[PDB]
Amino acid sequence: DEKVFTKELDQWIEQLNECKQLSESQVKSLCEKAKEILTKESNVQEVRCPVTVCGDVHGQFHDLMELFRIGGKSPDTNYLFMGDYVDRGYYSVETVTLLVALKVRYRERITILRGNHESRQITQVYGFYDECLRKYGNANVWKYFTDLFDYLPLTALVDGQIFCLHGGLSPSIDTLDHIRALDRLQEVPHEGPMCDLLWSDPDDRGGWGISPRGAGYTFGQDISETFNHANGLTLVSRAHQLVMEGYNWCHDRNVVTIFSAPNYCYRCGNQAAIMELDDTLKYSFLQFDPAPRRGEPHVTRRTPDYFL
């Protein structure tokens, strides 16, 4: 029955909250049920207000716990993560597992989009593959999650007015109907609309431009204004770019970037932010600092006990 699994899934969430990884067998079962839920979702997921929108976390699990402490615990608070759940963090396995576990348990409460780092190529370069290999001794866990990433929706639309995606606009996309026509069940292509949606960035330069990242494109204010009017959008919620203040309006408030990883890579020292959309669709921003780590920093200018 579903009841027995639901209680089992609840136990996993509590275990994951404590930052304890699930077993390889458990992960495999979780991923299999995740695909059944995700496969039914469109490339442009219809999200209903109220909801909290979050940016990149990049496996910073302790900061993810801070995010919940600020925005509230699921399922009480509806959440919408815009990708980049892994890499550049000591706890990518726990970070992605918890979010996936919540999605299976509360499919209607939490929505997870696909970020550029949700790719087989990227994950092997930036440490997620290593983390799984070290924490499990084999690539099976990495194989499961990378397969799961293919089913993650590319974009979400909140009350038909706010459009949320990881990367940004694309030259090949002019209407949301074009996005719905894409085939997302594949590895992140190096070119095309799917690649651009996960790699594009806003820019001050007018019109389209060459992306310094080597993928996607840079779009100016004129592009954003045309896209919003064409699709009747009020705002384009965006992620994938570091911002010191957590959020950064741009293009005459047509595009807003949200970054949810405080002290990015434990070095940047930036502020993280999450955008809360009220029941009336009115938006508010909450800025938070990194969670105080227990028994840290390792290097301190106060005399340690062994030297006192």
Binding site: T6, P50, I70, K73, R109, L286
Partner: protein
Amino acid sequence: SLYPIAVLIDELRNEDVQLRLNSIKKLSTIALALGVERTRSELLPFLTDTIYDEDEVLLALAEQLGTFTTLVGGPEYVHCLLPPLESLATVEETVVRDKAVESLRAISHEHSPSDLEAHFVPLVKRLAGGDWFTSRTSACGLFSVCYPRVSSAVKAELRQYFRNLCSDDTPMVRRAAASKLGEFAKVLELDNVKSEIIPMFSNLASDEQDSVRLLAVEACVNIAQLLPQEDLEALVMPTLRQAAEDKSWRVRYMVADKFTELQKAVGPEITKTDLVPAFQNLMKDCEAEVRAAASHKVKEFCENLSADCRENVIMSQILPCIKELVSDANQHVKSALASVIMGLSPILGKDNTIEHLLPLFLAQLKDECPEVRLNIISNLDCVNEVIGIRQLSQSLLPAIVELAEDAKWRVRLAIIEYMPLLAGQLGVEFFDEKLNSLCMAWLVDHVYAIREAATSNLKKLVEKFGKEWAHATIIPKVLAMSGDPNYLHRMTTLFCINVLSEVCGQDITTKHMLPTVLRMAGDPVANVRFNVAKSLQKIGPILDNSTLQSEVKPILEKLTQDQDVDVKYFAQEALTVLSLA
């Protein structure tokens, strides 16, 4: 039925540390099955020196060897356990050696006096005179257990061996000797303590190594308690004075850290003459660490002063130094004072507290650092019984308001935790006029953690002021949030009802809180709706059976028909828990 034992024995050779570790923890089972005679001749030689040297495995092995006396044949053959422990007392890991020394001390008591001089005392000599200083380091901890139960001739040899350790070239050995100097003197005769312990104590206290000298402070406390008070001036005080004036800040830190322990040992007479001037210097020490350590001891040190001059000394000598510390640049020094300065009010009395202590409290309440302000607020009970809180009320309130509205939410969290403590101290009347608004403002804070903390704050406040106050003051205001346009704030009302129902009782819950929960069941937001189902589940038991069948049941049944999956699940769960359907 010996197959399970065979698995454990073979696993000792297993490469897997976890499997090998598990077998070690069950050595009692293996030894029990093998037999007493076989254990001495077969098991112990295998464990005498194991090639595998994982710290966890060796640490577990040392623990087991300390409980093997019965398994080896009782006290008659207890000495057979020495060779396994002697090897463990030589490894490089410190914790393993410490555990091994602990095991040796435990089994030493079971050695007969003849056995000690035949098997145990020679073991101490081997470790003491060993070529590796790890063995010599372990030897320091074994002298005290064997010394009492040996002849005079053996005792003289032990004291000579201990003396050599105190003069060892390796600082590691000398540190161990300094650490164990106090306990070894406790078993020595008073004549030998004056003649032999003191020269060793004096030499170690003047050692070149700072890490060795600072250990002499602990030995000072132990030796002082042993000697008569009249002999402290000649033997102990000259060394203690040097420690307080030691160039190394680390040595001075230990004096400050254990100043109260020194105060008890030396006695009131020495405290006035020597410690009080020494304490003043420590509070004015150049190193911030020393001053912070001294600050913690201000309250305890003043309390222990003899009543003949306690008040005069504090006012004339200690109090002026405290004033400088209040304005200390270092944040940590000021924080240390705040947690203990409040304790001087009972000693000095009402008049002195108002004239001298009270200005200091006001100065620290206005300090920029939140930690200093929080510390003063958290320890107001020490001053409440002396002068009354009313005098502090007009000065506490501005500090509380600033903390309650601090930009950093974690700072706001800290003050919330002390709110019930302050509310009781300040009284119901003061809380309603001044502090009630602050508590409500937290419930609508942006940060969820603050709202969660405020919700639990209401329960603690109600537990003190009673049901009647909550109904008149709190309940009508929390229910007002039910109409908040933000669904996060509306759910806060349900959270408040969950904790309030536990205390407000059946009558208040049914008549005033229950109707609000039922009304919110039609909330357009699914998040609110299934929190109503959870809320009804928690407060359902408190309600009467008639109410459950009349009102709660029809509402829960309607929720099970809700389109949203989550609402149906929790609605079904609520009925099952409440046994309504």
